[PDB]
């Protein structure tokens, strides 16, 4: 018998369970719903979604990113939760491929539902899918091309990858400008992978084509009252000291005297200590001083009298970015001026962006840190542009780390499906059917990509399959007109890491979901 359908009841109130058929039905329904929702936002001709929050603030979000779509949705189906977490982990690993991996997992689970309806034990499906995944991974690895040795070819590959990544997003309107921007921003990192060194500043107003990558750096902080607003040949000192009612860290210390004259003397001594600290800072021979913490009025006027800029309250990210872009050292003690390196830049001034004022660092020495100003017509446009630029930067950083690239436009999926079919044609049993379903899902990915553009997806997929079977391993979808073409010539390329991660994560999630034959829910809180 079963726990639910037993004369005696074994559960508390509100706790139930779903047996084999019911659990499989619910899991497949949830997975197919997630896949259908996330799809239609896939490929060059994919539309965006409106995420209207039901909360008190009612946040409005217009996005094309699949991970963000799946993140901000109330999900109660546990398999849908599995797919959502897959998408989030895929986003964490690499910037792109969230929609691709989610759709692939959904199609795999649809094929699994069909196979189960065809009276096939799920373990056979899992074994066949493991074999097919091995074959597809081997084929994709054998298909990778590396161009990191050649500088110009690697730069061209970076431009192609950035364009391919930005083709689906809202930035496809100015794809060329945004691709150049993203490639330059990534190349300025000099091999470092910290995207936190790249700051994206969203300023409302202006066309989306008004966005630009600043040649130096931009800071959104202020300057002291009596300090210069513009210096030339700056010698910058970046610090992390207090300089705000700075107390000696002996917490048990106190002033205990028997006259107010002594209190005044101690106050004067405190001010003298602050003045001595400011003098020690000035002994470094600096023009601009940047502190992570607050700067109070007395050190402010002390800097002003010396004609030294004092930018205050630049947070940890701010001081890290300034150190990266100028080459200075974040110092907290000033007893050894010769052990501290000072950042240098040609010009510091205040610029007027929108209705706000920012500090502009021009002619920086190192420059291994970028700021990108995004101009848009709506807040939603700015947010979506930032998300798209983040995706492009993530993919470009991954390509810089690992230079292996594969061709997009469904070419990789078609090659994987061809390899899987070749493997399945020489295997007895129903595992051959399982691998055929694997290939069907792999082919369904470019089928959905073509459907989103309104083309004859069936005919295009048949042509691509025939071309790949014949031997044309670089054939792919051409969305300029709606035909098939050479992805190498047309310059649609993707990072090998992204495609491999998509394939492996989709296979893993399909395998873990398929193994489930019973869903047991506790009483909700």
């Amino acid at each position: 018998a079963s726990l639910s359908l037993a004369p005696v009841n074994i559960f508390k109130a509100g706790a139930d369970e779903e047996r084999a058929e019911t659990a499989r039905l619910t899991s497949f329904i949830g997975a197919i719903a997630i896949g259908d929702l996330v799809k239609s936002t896939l490929g060059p001709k994919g539309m965006d979604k409106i995420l209207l929050s039901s909360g008190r603030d009612a946040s409005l979000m217009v996005t094309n990113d699949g991970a963000t779509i799946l993140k901000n949705i109330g999900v109660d189906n546990p398999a849908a939760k599995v797919l959502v977490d897959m998408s989030r982990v895929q986003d964490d690993e690499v910037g792109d491929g969230t929609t691709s991996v989610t759709v692939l997992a959904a199609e795999l689970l649809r094929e699994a539902e069909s196979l189960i309806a065809k009276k096939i034990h799920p373990q056979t499906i899992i074994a066949g899918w493991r074999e097919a995944t091995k074959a597809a991974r081997e084929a994709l690895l054998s298909s990778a091309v590396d161009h990191g040795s050649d500088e110009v070819k690697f730069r061209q590959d970076l431009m192609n990858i950035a364009g391919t990544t930005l083709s689906s997003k809202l930035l496809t309107h100015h794809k060329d400008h945004f691709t150049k921007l993203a490639v330059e921003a990534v190349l300025r990192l000099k091999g470092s992978g910290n995207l936190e060194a790249i700051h994206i500043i969203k300023k409302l107003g202006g066309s989306l084509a008004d966005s630009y990558l600043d040649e130096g750096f931009l800071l959104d902080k202020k300057i002291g009252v009596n300090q210069p607003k513009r210096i030339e040949n700056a010698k910058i000192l970046i610090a992390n000291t207090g300089m705000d009612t700075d107390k000696i860290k002996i917490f048990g210390s106190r002033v205990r005297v028997d006259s107010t004259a002594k209190v005044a003397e101690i106050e004067h001594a405190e001010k003298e200590k602050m003045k001595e600290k400011v003098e020690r800072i000035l002994k470094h021979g600096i023009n601009c001083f940047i502190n992570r913490q607050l700067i109070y009025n007395y050190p402010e006027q002390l800097f002003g009298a010396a004609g030294v800029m004092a930018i205050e309250h630049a947070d940890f990210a701010g001081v890290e970015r300034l150190a990266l872009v100028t080459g200075g050292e974040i110092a907290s003690t000033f007893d050894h001026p010769e052990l501290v390196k000072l950042g240098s830049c040609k010009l510091i001034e205040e610029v007027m962006i929108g209705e706000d004022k920012l500090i502009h660092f021009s002619g920086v020495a190192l420059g291994e840190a970028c700021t990108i100003v995004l101009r848009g017509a709506t807040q939603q446009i700015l947010d979506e542009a930032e998300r798209s630029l983040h995706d492009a930067l993530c993919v470009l950083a991954q390509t810089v780390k690992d230079s292996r690239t594969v061709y997009g436009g469904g070419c990789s999926e078609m090659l994987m499906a061809h390899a899987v079919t070749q493997l399945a044609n020489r295997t007895p049993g129903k595992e051959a059917v399982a691998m055929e379903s694997y290939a069907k899902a792999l082919r369904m990915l470019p089928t959905i990509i073509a459907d989103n553009a309104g083309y004859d997806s069936a005919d295009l997929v048949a042509q691509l399959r025939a071309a790949h079977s014949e031997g044309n391993t670089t054939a792919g979808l051409d969305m300029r007109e709606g035909t098939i073409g050479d992805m190498a010539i047309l310059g649609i390329t993707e990072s090998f890491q992204v495609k491999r991660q998509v394939l492996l994560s989709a296979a893993e999630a399909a395998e873990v979901i398929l193994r489930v034959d019973n869903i047991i829910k506790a009483a909700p809180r």
Partner: protein, 540 residues
């Protein structure tokens, strides 16, 4: 059938005996026994589908909607939201099997359910449940003796780990991490063998750190003969890699000293203020100099430190890590061979730990940094780092690795093994059947019921793999009788042969003994209960 008694006296006066007796319920005798047997049968039938390599998983949802996909029987029953007392007994039996052995948490529940199912028919035939319990106990004694008889020994030596690898692979076969079967088994075996007291003593699990980070691939799970740390270097401009690091483990914050007793330092003049400021500055310089004098390259602190100490450490080419947890401090000290120092005044060269490589590791586009302290000389602590495509498979891999480590620990404690796949169950059932013939008639029924209940594991294994249960089990039993070979089981993987010795399906002997013992004791405890008094209040 409930509500206890209700008479209200034969004189018509009120008859109140037990507080709130009109809202309580009770069951007596055979009805209670049948209800217990039904509940246990339901639990066992639910659990039996998750048995063997072809066993399927259960998706468990807690109160907050969090989802765990698992095949571990103990976890499934622990997260399952039961109300029946016998179901709680089954859950506790599975937890007991997990605690003592670590594996076989699903077999015990199925065995107990089968035993109670046979006891149902025995009771229907008109046998006192105490007689059934005694027969079950003595049949279990016979089965345990047979298990000891048919056991085989293995080498737990470090030079040859192949039997250990096979045992770990057999343990991990039913889990989802079988896609990296041999790799996971080998890392588990190496982990257990590394952190173990050689002379058959205990394997201490606080020396094994299991960490799971999302991203990467499940194949990227690796064994680190050191410590993985969630922290990173304190100063952002500190170097990201130290070679031949001479660690300096400290539990003192790099701050001016502070007495624990309530205290007040009086400042009465300007000279006092100057002396206090000089004292603070000189304390910072002195602690940095004391750290540097030992020749250390890396400093590890537990309680964090402030800006002046951070910049002094950066300026003196001394990478440092702050806010390291106490267990992590202990693990680092054990692995690197250093000593935990409570203050800088006691820091010497001989208390410094040595690590071949200290590195900071990125995880893609996440900003999350973690620290690796590996390449130790004779590291007595080990760490397992698990990757995956989602957190759920990460948790499942964590519990599968725990199962493998527990199995290897059991092998270290006792090196005798028996061959699984239902071969041990079939041999025990045959031994019980031969013993029943010599026994007087009355206990024969109990012994035969015990044997038939033992035969459920091969039936479940065959049914889960798609084969016909009764035909396969009967054929295997006939083959075992025909040729003396207690290694013939259920070919779940369809490898062609039934000999589990050749197929390397290996289980710990003590695991099977504990399975049978715990199942028998719980079945007896349930069979001895003939009365329930629930509150029956339907409270909220």
């Amino acid at each position: 059938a409930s509500m206890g008694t209700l008479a209200f006296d034969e004189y018509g006066r009120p008859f109140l005996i037990i507080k709130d007796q009109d809202r309580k319920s009770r069951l007596m005798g055979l009805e209670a026994l049948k209800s217990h047997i039904m509940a246990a049968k339901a639990v066992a039938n639910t659990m039996r589908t998750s048995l063997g390599p072809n066993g399927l998983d259960k998706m468990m949802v807690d109160k907050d909607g969090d989802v765990t996909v698992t095949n571990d029987g103990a976890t499934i029953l622990s997260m399952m939201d039961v109300d029946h007392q016998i179901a709680k007994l089954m859950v506790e039996l599975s937890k007991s099997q997990d605690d003592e052995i670590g594996d076989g948490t699903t077999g015990v529940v199925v065995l107990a359910g089968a035993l109670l199912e046979e006891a149902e028919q025995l009771l229907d035939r008109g046998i006192h449940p105490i007689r059934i319990a005694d027969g079950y106990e003595q049949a279990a004694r016979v089965a345990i003796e047979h298990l000891d008889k048919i056991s085989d020994s293995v080498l737990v030596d470090i030079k040859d780990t192949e039997p250990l690898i096979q045992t770990a692979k057999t343990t991990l076969g039913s889990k989802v991490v079988n896609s990296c079967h041999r790799q996971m088994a080998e890392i588990a075996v190496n982990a257990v063998l590394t952190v173990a007291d050689m002379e058959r003593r205990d394997v201490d699990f606080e020396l094994i750190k299991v960490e799971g980070k999302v991203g990467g691939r499940l194949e990227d799970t690796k064994l680190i003969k050191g410590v993985i740390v969630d922290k990173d270097f304190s100063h952002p401009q500190m170097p990201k890699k130290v070679e031949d690091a001479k660690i300096a483990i400290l539990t003192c914050p790099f701050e001016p000293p502070k007495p624990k007793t309530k205290h007040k330092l009086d400042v009465t003049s300007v000279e006092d203020y100057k002396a206090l400021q000089k004292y603070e500055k000189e304390k910072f310089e002195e602690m940095i100099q004391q750290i540097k004098e030992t020749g250390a390259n890396l400093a590890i602190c537990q309680w964090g430190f402030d800006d002046e100490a951070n910049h002094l450490l950066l300026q003196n080419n001394l990478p440092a890590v702050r806010w390291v947890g106490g267990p992590e401090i202990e693990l680092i000290a054990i692995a690197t061979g250093g000593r935990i120092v409570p203050r800088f005044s006691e820091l010497t060269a001989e208390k410094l730990g040595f690590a071949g490589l200290v590195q900071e590791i990125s995880f893609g586009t996440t900003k999350d940094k973690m620290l690796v302290i590996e390449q130790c000389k004779n590291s007595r602590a080990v760490t397992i780092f698990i990757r995956g495509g989602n957190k759920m498979i990460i948790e499942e891999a964590k519990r599968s690795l725990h199962d493998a480590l527990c199995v290897i620990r059991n092998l270290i404690r006792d090196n005798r093994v028996v061959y699984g796949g239902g071969a041990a169950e079939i041999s025990c059932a045959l031994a019980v059947s031969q013993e029943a013939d010599k026994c007087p008639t009355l206990e024969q029924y109990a012994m035969r019921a015990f044997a038939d209940a033992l035969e459920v594991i091969p039936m479940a294994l065959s049914e889960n793999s798609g084969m016909n249960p009764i035909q396969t089990m009967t054929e295997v039993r006939a083959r075992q009788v025909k040729e003396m070979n207690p290694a013939l089981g259920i070919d779940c993987l369809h490898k062609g042969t039934n000999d589990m010795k050749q197929q390397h399906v290996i289980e710990t002997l003590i695991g099977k003994k504990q399975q049978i013992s715990l199942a028998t004791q719980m079945v007896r405890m349930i069979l001895k209960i003939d009365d329930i008094r629930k509150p029956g209040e339907s409270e909220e």
